[PDB]
Design a protein around this ligand. Structure first.
Ligand SMILES: Nc1nc2c(ncn2[C@@H]2O[C@H](COP(=O)(O)OP(=O)(O)O)[C@@H](O)[C@H]2O)c(=O)[nH]1
Ligand SMILES: [Mg+2]
Length: 172
């Protein structure tokens, strides 16, 4: 089938919303799941089921910061027999700190010097997926930041091409 669950993993300020907003703009048949606008994680799940029932692809724009957080979405993939691909945004804590410092307001409340302190607290819990330890993810792309702060349609195409060159970890 044409559809997938795309799990974004990355720190606050790493660029998850930038990528996901451009993706749904650029490519037919994609919906963005986001809790800071959606309401609750159950509401995210509810919307995800509705979209998968329509055979849509979904991009999970959440930090997806450890194995237990990712399991929600991997279980959903298994139930629907829909593959789970993952993009890990490889911005460092210092890069994200600098970006957060530049926010004046934000739906997450991770803003400015307050936001920097939040990020520091978060680092205790951030456990991105490893190629070895198998969670049921099909492929993992580790995506370097672009020099530019915006995401183009061309970047979206580059990303999907890079993802296609990633080895299959768990076969459908
Ligand atoms: N230089 C650079 N900036 C990015 C990139 N991706 C996002 N940004 C910038 O980093 C900031 C945080 O991005 P955001 O999408 O809000 O991060 P999120 O918290 O992970 O949703 C934004 O100002 C973006 O323009 C990237 O690949 N490279
Ligand atoms: Mg965001």
């Amino acid at each position: 089938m044409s559809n997938r669950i795309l799990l974004l993993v990355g720190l606050p300020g790493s660029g998850k919303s930038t990528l996901s907003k451009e993706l749904v703009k650029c490519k037919s048949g994609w919906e963005r799941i986001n809790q800071d606008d959606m309401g609750s994680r159950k509401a995210c799940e509810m919307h995800a089921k509705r979209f998968l029932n329509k055979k849509l692809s979904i991009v999970i724009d959440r930090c997806n910061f450890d194995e237990k957080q990712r399991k929600t979405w991997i279980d959903l993939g298994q139930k629907y027999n829909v593959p789970v691909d993952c993009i890990v945004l490889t911005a460092t804590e210092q890069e994200c700190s600098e970006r957060i410092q530049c926010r004046v307001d934000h739906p997450t409340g991770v803003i400015g010097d307050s936001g920097v302190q939040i990020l520091k607290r978060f680092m205790r819990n951030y456990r991105p997926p490893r190629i070895d330890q198998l969670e049921g993810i099909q492929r993992i792309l580790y995506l370097d930041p672009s020099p530019e702060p915006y995401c183009t349609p061309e970047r979206i195409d580059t990303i999907f091409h890079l993802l296609d060159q990633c080895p299959i970890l768990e076969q459908m």
